[PDB]
Amino acid sequence: GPGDKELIDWLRLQGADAKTIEKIVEEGYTLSDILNEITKEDLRYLRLRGGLLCRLWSAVSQYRRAQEASE
């Protein structure tokens, strides 16, 4: 979909494999959704493997902390 290039590139930077990337894209997640809206429970429901889930959530959490910290 339009704007998935930004999402796909960021997912690959967190070490996501092609099948995982397909799953996330098929749900119509945007990068905005991942950075701002998703919960860890969304990632578990997607059946993400632990390594990627750990990495991805650590990236999302640091982004959110920085935004909130910067106020």
Side-chain angles (χ1 to χ4, degrees):
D4 282 338
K5 184 186 150 60
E6 60 161 18
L7 172 64
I8 290 172
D9 289 344
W10 182 92
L11 289 175
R12 286 211 234 83
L13 193 64
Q14 314 318 312
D17 61 287
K19 302 245 78 209
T20 299
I21 287 170
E22 287 173 11
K23 278 168 69 196
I24 294 173
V25 162
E26 288 173 355
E27 295 304 320
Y29 288 106
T30 63
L31 184 49
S32 185
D33 299 324
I34 297 310
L35 294 173
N36 299 295
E37 311 286 304
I38 64 161
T39 68
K40 225 179 315 199
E41 189 280 341
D42 293 309
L43 303 173
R44 299 220 134 99
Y45 184 79
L46 289 158
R47 302 177 175 107
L48 305 200
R49 297 181 195 97
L52 174 69
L53 193 149
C54 174
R55 282 190 313 261
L56 197 155
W57 186 248
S58 61
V60 170
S61 303
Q62 294 179 54
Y63 173 71
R64 299 181 181 177
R65 285 193 257 98
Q67 178 181 251
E68 182 206 5
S70 69
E71 172 275 332

